[PDB]
Design an enzyme around this catalytic site. Sequence first.
Site, PDB file in Angstrom:
ATOM      1  N   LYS A 181       0.806 -14.923 -20.298  1.00 34.99           N
ATOM      2  CA  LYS A 181       1.996 -14.407 -21.084  1.00 34.99           C
ATOM      3  C   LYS A 181       2.989 -15.669 -20.957  1.00 34.99           C
ATOM      4  O   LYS A 181       3.192 -16.245 -20.079  1.00 34.99           O
ATOM      5  CB  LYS A 181       2.628 -13.255 -20.130  1.00 34.99           C
ATOM      6  CG  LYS A 181       4.015 -12.921 -20.531  1.00 34.99           C
ATOM      7  CD  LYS A 181       4.270 -11.418 -20.646  1.00 34.99           C
ATOM      8  CE  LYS A 181       4.732 -10.854 -19.210  1.00 34.99           C
ATOM      9  NZ  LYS A 181       5.779  -9.769 -19.397  1.00 34.99           N
ATOM     10  N   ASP A 203       2.915  -5.046 -16.501  1.00 28.84           N
ATOM     11  CA  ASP A 203       4.129  -5.431 -16.658  1.00 28.84           C
ATOM     12  C   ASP A 203       5.338  -4.583 -15.963  1.00 28.84           C
ATOM     13  O   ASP A 203       5.285  -3.369 -16.632  1.00 28.84           O
ATOM     14  CB  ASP A 203       4.715  -5.616 -18.186  1.00 28.84           C
ATOM     15  CG  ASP A 203       3.225  -6.531 -18.838  1.00 28.84           C
ATOM     16  OD1 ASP A 203       2.230  -6.360 -18.927  1.00 28.84           O
ATOM     17  OD2 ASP A 203       4.033  -7.586 -19.320  1.00 28.84           O
ATOM     18  N   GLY A 241       5.426  -9.206 -28.400  1.00 28.92           N
ATOM     19  CA  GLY A 241       6.585  -8.065 -28.056  1.00 28.92           C
ATOM     20  C   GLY A 241       7.768  -9.000 -27.821  1.00 28.92           C
ATOM     21  O   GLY A 241       7.705  -9.914 -27.254  1.00 28.92           O
TER      22      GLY A 241
END
Length: 348
Positions: free
Chosen positions: A49, A164, A29
Site C-alpha cells: 500500500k 485497513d 482509492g
Amino acid sequence: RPTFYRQELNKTIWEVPERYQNLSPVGSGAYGSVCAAFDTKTGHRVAVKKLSRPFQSIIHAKRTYRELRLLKHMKHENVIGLLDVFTPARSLEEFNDVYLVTHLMGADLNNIVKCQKLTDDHVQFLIYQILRGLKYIHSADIIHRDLKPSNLAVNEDCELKILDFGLARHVATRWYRAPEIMLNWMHYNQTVDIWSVGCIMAELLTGRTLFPGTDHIDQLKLILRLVGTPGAELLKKISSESARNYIQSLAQMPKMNFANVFIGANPLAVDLLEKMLVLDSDKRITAAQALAHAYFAQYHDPDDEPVADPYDQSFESRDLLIDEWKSLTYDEVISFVPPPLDQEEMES
Ligand SMILES: CNC(=O)c1cc(-n2ncc3cc(Nc4c(F)cccc4Cl)c(CN4CCC4)cc32)cs1
Ligand SMILES: CCCCCCCCO[C@@H]1O[C@H](CO)[C@@H](O)[C@H](O)[C@H]1O
Ligand SMILES: CCCCCCCCO[C@@H]1O[C@H](CO)[C@@H](O)[C@H](O)[C@H]1O
C-alpha cells in the site's frame, strides 16, 4: 539500503525494492493505492500500500503517523500485520512517500459472499475470527471504525484477517457503519465495531446486504425499520429537544422480530444478532462477551484469544507542526523491525 526500482501502474508511480516483483494493482482509492507483488526474498505474495500525499497537510501528516503507529502495533493472527515498511528516500528532507507491506490474502468477503452461499459452520468460523481479532484490538483501547467486507480477507482455509483501520477521528461505504457515527454523537463506544460485525454476520447468513442505503438519510431509514424507533430509555440520553421532537414525529416503528427476519438461520445465530444490532450502543454485546456466546462453542478457547500490549496513543491529543509529524513518521520507518519467519517456513 536495498536498491529501488520504479514502475508505473494505473497512472501511479511505484518506487520499491528489487525484492518485490510482478506488481499488479489490486485497487485504487483515496484511502490508498494498493498492488499485489511477489516477494522474491520469501517466496510469498504480498500486498503493498502506497500512502498518497502523506505530508500534504497537518491532517494528512498526523493521519500518516496514526496508521503507521497502529499497524506497527498489531501482532495477532486475525489482524493485518506489517511485514515491511519502506521509503525510497535516504534522508528525512527527501522523505515524502511511505509504503506498507503485508501478506497477500486470497479473497475478501465481498468475493466470498458472491462466490458461494455459506454454511452455518462457515459463518461461525468467520465471525468467530473477526471477534477474536476485535477482542485484541479493543484490548489496546483502539476502535477499528471501518469493519466491512472489503476490509476482511481469507485464505484457502477460511483463515481471516481484519485489514485497513478507520483513520478518521473527531468512496467509503456507509452500509456497515453504526448509526451514532453517522449522527455525529462524538463519543463512540468500542461497540460501534460490534454494530459492523452484526451487519456483516447478517450478510454472511442471507447473502444480502442488511442495510444497503442509497445515501445518508436512507441508511438511517433502513436501520430504524429493522431495530425500531428509539425507546424511552434511549430517548432519556438525548439532550436536544428538537432532535427528540423530530424522532417522536416519525411514524413509530417497533423493532422487528429477528427470528422472522432471519427465518431459517441457526436460532443461536439469531440470538447473537439481536445482541449485536441494538440501537443503544451501551446495550450491545462486547467482543469478549460474544466470543463466549453458545454460537461459537465449536471454536471458543479462553486460553487462545490473546490481548494486546498497551498502546501509547498520547499523540492523538497533540497539536504539532507538519515537520514534526513528518519527523516522527520517519523515525518509525527507520525503527521498524520485520517479524521473524514462521517456524513452518524453515526446515531442519
Ligand atoms: C487474490 N487476492 C485478493 O484478491 C485480495 C487480497 C487483498 N489483501 N490482502 C491483504 C491486504 C491488505 C490491504 N491493505 C494493506 C496493504 F495492502 C498493505 C499494508 C497494510 C494494509 Cl492495511 C488491502 C487493501 N485494503 C483496502 C481494502 C483492502 C488488501 C489486501 C484483498 S482482496
Ligand atoms: C434531528 C434528529 C437527529 C437525532 C440524532 C440524535 C441526536 C444525538 O445528538 C447527540 O446527543 C448527544 C447526547 O445528548 C450529545 O452529546 C451530542 O453532542 C449530540 O450530537
Ligand atoms: C434515530 C437515530 C438513532 C441513533 C441512536 C444511536 C444511539 C447509540 O447509543 C448511544 O451511543 C452513545 C455513544 O456514541 C452513548 O454515549 C449513549 O449512551 C448511547 O445511548
